[PDB]
């Protein structure tokens with residue numbers, strides 16, 4: 001599923017991401033934009049052999065099992081495929097764990113490089129929320 005901007009904002013809020021760990025909704029929408037272009041099916045292989053999955057590009061190195069990342073963990077206790085669903089529940093639940101891990105949203109390098117310190121409210125501008 002490819003979400004619309006405001007559509008994803010609403011879904012994220014419904015699943016309790018808005019202001020989660022102090023991060024406003026615009027931060028989460030901005031992260032999703034640059035991670036996946038709002039596409040739940042997005043996958044990207046990393047040079048180390050891990051793969052990033054879904055709307056928030058969650059890494060198999062630590063967070064989900066894909067059966068092909070040697071020495072990795074599955075800290076969200078989920079198949080990485082579950083992170084590709086049209087329903088964002090699994091991705092949101094896992095993202096909550098990731099953002100609570102100590103480094104906040106810096107875990108998402110794209111967030112750090114493209115969203116951090118910017119006018120992230122623009123991402124939810126005009127949305128019926």
Ligand SMILES: NC(=[NH2+])NCCC[C@H](N)C(=O)O
Pocket residue numbers: 048059061062
């Ligand atoms: N998200 C991470 N911390 N990735 C680190 C890479 C995993 C492992 N250190 C490797 O070299 O293959």
Ligand SMILES: NC(=[NH2+])NCCC[C@H](N)C(=O)O
Pocket residue numbers: 062073075101
């Ligand atoms: N048992 C763990 N490794 N927990 C957290 C590890 C995940 C974290 N991204 C790291 O690099 O360490």
Ligand SMILES: NC(=[NH2+])NCCC[C@H](N)C(=O)O
Pocket residue numbers: 035044045046057107108109110111
């Ligand atoms: N951890 C991140 N958010 N990285 C952003 C860059 C993603 C890019 N597709 C890559 O190959 O790494």
Ligand SMILES: NC(=[NH2+])NCCC[C@H](N)C(=O)O
Pocket residue numbers: 122123124125126
């Ligand atoms: N600098 C940016 N590209 N911000 C995101 C803009 C999102 C959308 N076009 C809005 O203003 O509601």
Ligand SMILES: [Cl-]
Pocket residue numbers: 021022103104105
């Ligand atoms: Cl933080």
Ligand code: NA
Pocket residue numbers: 060061062063064065066067069072073074
């Ligand atoms: Na894994």
